[PDB]
Design a protein around this ligand. Structure first.
Ligand SMILES: *[C@@H]1O[C@H](CO)[C@@H](O[C@@H]2O[C@H](CO)[C@@H](O[C@@H]3O[C@H](CO)[C@@H](O[C@@H]4O[C@H](CO)[C@@H](O)[C@H](O)[C@H]4NC(C)=O)[C@H](O)[C@H]3NC(C)=O)[C@H](O)[C@H]2NC(C)=O)[C@H](O)[C@H]1NC(C)=O
Ligand SMILES: *[C@@H]1O[C@H](CO)[C@@H](O[C@@H]2O[C@H](CO)[C@@H](O[C@@H]3O[C@H](CO)[C@@H](O)[C@H](O)[C@H]3NC(C)=O)[C@H](O)[C@H]2NC(C)=O)[C@H](O)[C@H]1NC(C)=O
Ligand SMILES: *[C@@H]1O[C@H](CO)[C@@H](O[C@@H]2O[C@H](CO)[C@@H](O)[C@H](O)[C@H]2NC(C)=O)[C@H](O)[C@H]1NC(C)=O
Ligand SMILES: *[C@@H]1O[C@H](CO)[C@@H](O[C@@H]2O[C@H](CO)[C@@H](O)[C@H](O)[C@H]2NC(C)=O)[C@H](O)[C@H]1NC(C)=O
Ligand SMILES: *[C@@H]1O[C@H](CO)[C@@H](O[C@@H]2O[C@H](CO)[C@@H](O)[C@H](O)[C@H]2NC(C)=O)[C@H](O)[C@H]1NC(C)=O
Ligand SMILES: *[C@@H]1O[C@H](CO)[C@@H](O)[C@H](O)[C@H]1NC(C)=O
Ligand SMILES: [Ca+2]
Length: 964
């Protein structure tokens, strides 16, 4: 009938024995272990005190941020003093102001008051661009004239900042950028570089997120759009565009909701109270306002009574300060005094009124509302005025923090965002600058309640990664830092790409905000740990977690130890993740000049012939040594460096070089002594070895070309996978790819090398075997079938018409099968080939599944969904009946004990028809979580506590109605 359980347990046992014996006696795990023990005294074991490493890194980050803050402080002081000393000239001799303008052609071969500079740019690898240190540059947006009186008057008093720009760089050479945004629109950054290279420049320094952060406090904005018969036509389009643009000026710390009202007010989107101005909530609001219609007869007394009620809802999270209402209308006759006298007598809610479009309605009432209720009045007559008339409310909002004196001047760091000058991921510290003309003597306070601008220095994430070395840990260990909003500052899965917002509809300005829980969301532990780090505490938590493999196909149930501590002085919280086996590391010895010689004579370009092709990790060892994408150039440069100097003395990383050469010696001794004895083996294609220390040695010469793995050891998916497993790990290859398939490269199986120095545990290397496909094909069809069993086939064969015999891994990917058509699809997900059996396996809990969302992904027409499968029963019997399509197929599943594979044998697939409903495991473009449900249960966050939203000294005469 069907093969018995004992027959299956013998067949799988024999296949196990064969594969495990071949892997153990071919890859030489025990031999390499013995080599590591018996070459002791060349290295020492050192602890990884997480409680000390995280503290040291936190202090380093604090010192970096204090260095970058002192420059801002002194720059702000100098700018304030110079502006106080300035004189308002209204007549220039056409050559009195001198600057670069950073946007002119370098070769004009040819103004009202300015004389241009022809500078010299050489190069700088620190920036990638061409820079000049002799002077700063100026960026004046296209819309604004470069020769108006106000611009030239600013150019004079901002020319003085160049000396301080130079001085700060002289103190700390690592400064990247030092920008001074101005309230008039121009910006001055110290390293003089041309502006960015369809080329119409829409940049405006008064709209960048750092300027907006430093110019005011977190807001509670409620946009009150007016829908009516009058606003139909062009006015509606202008209102739509204006609402979108003004939404673009909000930040993560700000809460916003959009309402509309023709005769009874209603929410324009699913949100009902208030939502954080994330990159998703803003998109939802933009779509809702873009799907709006104009009908009915305007009723202000209901719209305002609705807005004031939604600004009083305290059941939800909000910034709890700067409660401001925006009215986008055209014009009317009702001023609604009763509503304001009912809701806002103490005047705690600001009202800004906008008169959008070209009309002839009475604008008087809206100016009156903007005057009585503390605010300002705007007009948008065309598309070109939307940007300016929507970016100006920060000028009104910044008055109370100006009147606070030298108390609102605190350095505040922004979110991670891509630099405008193509520098990668950077964060910016902002410090406002106040107008203090006539401050020493008490005469002038008329215009002294507006900021001059916001200073800013950029620090790259590369510096912060430099402050947190990761080469003394295992590849599974890393650092990460979280701001109070939950977003990651450092994390290995944070990449320089904009955050996806939804499905890419058919037919670089946004911040890169990735929450911590978008690494592997675990309800029990990684939520409480996140909430503790956000609160600003320190602790340790050892727990059994799930880690997603680097290739994003496998999941391991490993043990990790989360240690965190706050970065005191700032708001970021640093944490360090360490597994149990990474509590110790091998520190190489000084050895002697002789050891360097023969440890270097192993990895020469002409020499990897009897030792196998040798890789090297592009880790910066020496300052002169340069990282190269191609491994051969790095190998040659490393050889010439280690030949030409000693490692330690010439201001190089002694530990890194010493450990690399120690690994080279150990691996060379291993490959020679053991692998050189047996040149060819029946079932292996390539013997490889990867060690912590950035060296890889594929023994066969012709097999070195097929090595598609990353030369960096700490970024190999198989290495990290094998580190977390105490047994042999089988890596499924790729299917339908332009590279070599699993017929000339082989199947990769790897085992983690384990050593016991003293009593401590260490896993410094991973060895493995590339299994020949054809040998295992001819071995699989003779150890499974009984010869004199029956007329009908009891088991499978090379072409089994009925019986199906496949072997899988712990990720659902197929490795072998009896049928030629099946084995032609090696590495393919078994759900695609046989969906019904996979679905039944999942239902009877054979492969657990749990999915994640990838936000930094690109799509061909974007958020992307992912799925990974693994074991969840750690048992062997696993017997059941499909009952598929009224054609029952009895199936038996057995798992090879030492390896991570499972042997599942079904009666047949083609004979019994079933539904297909293909079970795909590949990434699919899809919308993320529903924003409405997400905001119904918001995540934990801690908003800033400082806020300046009211002051009795503030002057309210500047209403905007009488001023134009
Ligand atoms: C920081 O604050 C200080 C003061 O607190 C500020 O300095 C003041 O700047 C204004 C210009 O914005 C000067 O205004 C004077 O007023 C006269 C009279 O109005 C102006 O002359 C004409 O004014 C009309 C409008 O009234 C206008 O068309 C145009 O400005 C002028 N027209 C013509 C044809 O000339 C001048 O603007 C100006 N007078 C002179 C002689 O320059 C104040 O005098 C300044 N106050 C002080 C004490 O210096 C300073 O700008 C603020 N910082 C920044 C960056 O703006
Ligand atoms: C904006 O343009 C202004 C006009 O040119 C500049 O102001 C001028 O700078 C000159 C220096 O190059 C001054 O000359 C000196 O002033 C001192 C005053 O203490 C006097 O001894 C002399 O006039 C002169 N001395 C020497 C040794 O040359 C001008 O007085 C001064 N003002 C003018 C010409 O009206 C500003 O420098 C420029 N803005 C900034 C921020 O520099
Ligand atoms: C949520 O906000 C509402 C008003 O915005 C608060 O008002 C209460 O609503 C519940 C709902 O049935 C009732 O107890 C009363 O209608 C209200 N109680 C009053 C006015 O005292 C409500 O209290 C808020 N939620 C919580 C949990 O406090
Ligand atoms: C940041 O500074 C604070 C001080 O405000 C540190 O907290 C103190 O740490 C010392 C030992 O380092 C303890 O003796 C004190 O009791 C701590 N004071 C507390 C907890 O209020 C904190 O350790 C520093 N953190 C880092 C990462 O440097
Ligand atoms: C995410 O995947 C994990 C991996 O199994 C799930 O953990 C188990 O899930 C099953 C049901 O899906 C439960 O019966 C088990 O009790 C879970 N194990 C533990 C230790 O909790 C998890 O449920 C999946 N879903 C979520 C939201 O995490
Ligand atoms: C901070 O600045 C001082 C001097 O300006 C410098 O010696 C120190 O290395 C800096 N710390 C950093 C860059 O972490
Ligand atoms: Ca109307």
């Amino acid at each position: 009938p069907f093969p018995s359980a004992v027959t299956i347990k013998s067949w799988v046992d024999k296949m196990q024995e064969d594969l495990v014996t071949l892997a153990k006696t071919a890859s030489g795990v025990n031999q390499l272990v013995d080599i590591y023990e018996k070459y002791q005294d060349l290295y020492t074991v050192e602890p990884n005190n997480a409680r000390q490493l995280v503290e040291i890194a936190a202090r380093d980050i604090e010192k970096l941020l204090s260095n970058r803050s002192k420059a801002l402080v002194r720059l702000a002081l100098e700018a304030e003093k110079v502006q106080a000393a300035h004189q308002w000239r209204e007549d220039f001799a056409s050559n009195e102001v001198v600057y670069y303008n950073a946007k002119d052609d370098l070769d004009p071969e040819k103004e009202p008051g300015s004389q241009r500079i022809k500078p010299v740019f050489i190069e700088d690898a620190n920036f990638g661009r061409q820079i000049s240190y002799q002077h700063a540059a100026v960026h004046i947006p296209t819309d604004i004239y470069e020769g108006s009186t106000i611009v030239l008057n600013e150019l004079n008093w901002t020319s003085a900042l160049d000396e301080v720009f130079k001085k700060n760089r002289e103190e700390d050479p690592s400064l990247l950028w030092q920008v001074f945004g101005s309230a008039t629109g121009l910006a001055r950054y110290y390293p003089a570089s041309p502006w960015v290279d369809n080329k119409i420049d829409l940049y405006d320094v008064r709209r960048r997120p750092w300027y907006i952060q430093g110019a005011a406090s977190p807001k509670d904005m409620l946009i009150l759009v007016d829908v009516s018969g009058s606003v139909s036509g062009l006015t509606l389009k202008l209102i739509r565009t204006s609402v979108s643009e003004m939404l673009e000026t909000l930040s993560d710390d700000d809460f916003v909701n959009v309402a509309s009202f023709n005769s009874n007010a209603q929410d324009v989107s699913c949100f009902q109270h208030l939502v954080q101005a994330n990159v998703r909530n803003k998109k939802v609001l933009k779509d809702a306002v873009n799907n709006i219609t104009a009908k009915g007869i305007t009723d202000y007394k209901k719209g305002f009574s609705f807005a004031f009620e939604q600004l009083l809802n305290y059941n939800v999270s909000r910034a709890n300060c700067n409660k401001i209402i925006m009215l986008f209308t055209d014009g009317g006759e009702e001023r609604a005094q009763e509503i304001f006298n009912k809701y806002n007598k103490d005047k705690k809610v600001r009202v800004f009124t906008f008169s959008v479009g070209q009309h002839n309605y009475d604008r008087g009432p809206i100016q009156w509302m903007a005057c009585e209720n503390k605010g300002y009045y705007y007009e948008i007559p065309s598309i070109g005025a939307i940007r300016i008339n929507t970016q100006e409310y920060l000028d009104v909002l910044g008055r109370p923090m100006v009147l606070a004196g030298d108390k609102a001047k605190q350095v505040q760091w922004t979110n991670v965002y891509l630099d405008a000058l193509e520098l990668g991921l950077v964060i910016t510290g902002t410090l406002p600058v106040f107008n203090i003309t006539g401050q020493f003597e008490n005469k002038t306070n008329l215009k002294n309640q507006l900021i001059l601008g916001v200073m800013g220095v950029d620090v790259s994430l590369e510096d912060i990664k430099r402050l947190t070395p990761r080469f003394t840990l295992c590849p599974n260990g890393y650092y990460f830092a979280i701001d109070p909003n939950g977003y990651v500052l450092l994390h290995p899965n944070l990449q320089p790409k904009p955050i996806g917002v939804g499905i890419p509809t058919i037919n670089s300005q946004e911040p890169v905000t990735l929450d911590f829980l978008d690494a592997e969301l675990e309800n029990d532990i990684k939520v409480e740990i996140r909430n503790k780090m956000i609160d600003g505490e320190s602790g340790e938590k050892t727990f059994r977690t799930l880690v997603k493999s680097q290739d994003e196909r496998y999941i391991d149930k490993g043990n990790r130890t989360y240690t965190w501590t706050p970065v005191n002085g700032t708001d970021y919280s640093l944490a360090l993740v360490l597994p149990t086996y990474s509590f110790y590391y091998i520190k190489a010895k000084l050895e002697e000049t002789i050891t360097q010689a023969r440890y270097s004579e192993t990895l020469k370009p002409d020499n990897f012939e009897e030792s196998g092709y040798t890789f090297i990790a592009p880790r910066d060892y020496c300052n002169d040594l340069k990282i190269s994408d191609n491994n051969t150039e790095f190998l040659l440069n490393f050889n010439e460096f280690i030949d030409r100097k000693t490692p330690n003395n010439p201001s190089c990383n002694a530990d890194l070089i010493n450990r690399v050469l120690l690994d080279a010696g150990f691996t060379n001794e291993l490959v020679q002594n053991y692998w050189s004895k047996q040149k060819n083996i029946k079932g292996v294609k390539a013997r490889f070895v990867v060690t912590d220390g950035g060296i890889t040695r594929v023994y066969p010469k012709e097999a070195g070309e097929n090595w598609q793995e990353n030369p960096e050891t700490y970024e190999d998916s198989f290495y990290k996978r094998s580190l977390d497993n105490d047994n042999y790990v089988f890596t499924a290859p790729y299917f339908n790819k332009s590279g070599p398939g699993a017929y000339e490269s082989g199947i990769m199986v790897s085992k983690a090398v384990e050593i016991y120095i003293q009593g401590k545990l260490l896993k410094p290397a991973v060895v493995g075997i590339k299994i020949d496909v054809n040998s295992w094909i001819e071995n699989f069809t003779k150890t499974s079938i009984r010869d004199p069993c029956a007329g009908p086939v009891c088991d499978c064969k090379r072409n089994s018409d009925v019986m199906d015999c496949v072997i899988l891994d712990d990720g659902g990917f197929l490795l072998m099968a009896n049928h030629d058509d099946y084995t032609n699809q090696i590495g393919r997900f078994f759900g695609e080939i046989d969906p019904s059996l996979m679905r039944h396996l999942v239902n009877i809990s054979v492969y657990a599944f749990n999915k994640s969302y990838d936000y930094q992904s690109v799509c061909e027409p974007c958020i992307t969904e992912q799925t990974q499968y693994f074991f969840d029963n750690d048992s062997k019997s696993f017997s059941g009946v499909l009952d598929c399509g009224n054609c029952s197929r009895i199936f038996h599943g057995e798992k090879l004990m030492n390896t991570n594979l499972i042997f599942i044998m079904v009666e047949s697939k083609g004979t019994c028809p079933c539904d297909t409903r293909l079970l795909i495991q590949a990434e699919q473009t899809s919308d993320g979580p529903n924003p409405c449900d997400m905001v119904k249960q918001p995540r934990y966050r801690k908003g800033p506590d400082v806020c300046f939203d009211n002051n009795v000294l503030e002057d309210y005469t500047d209403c905007g109605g009488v001023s134009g």
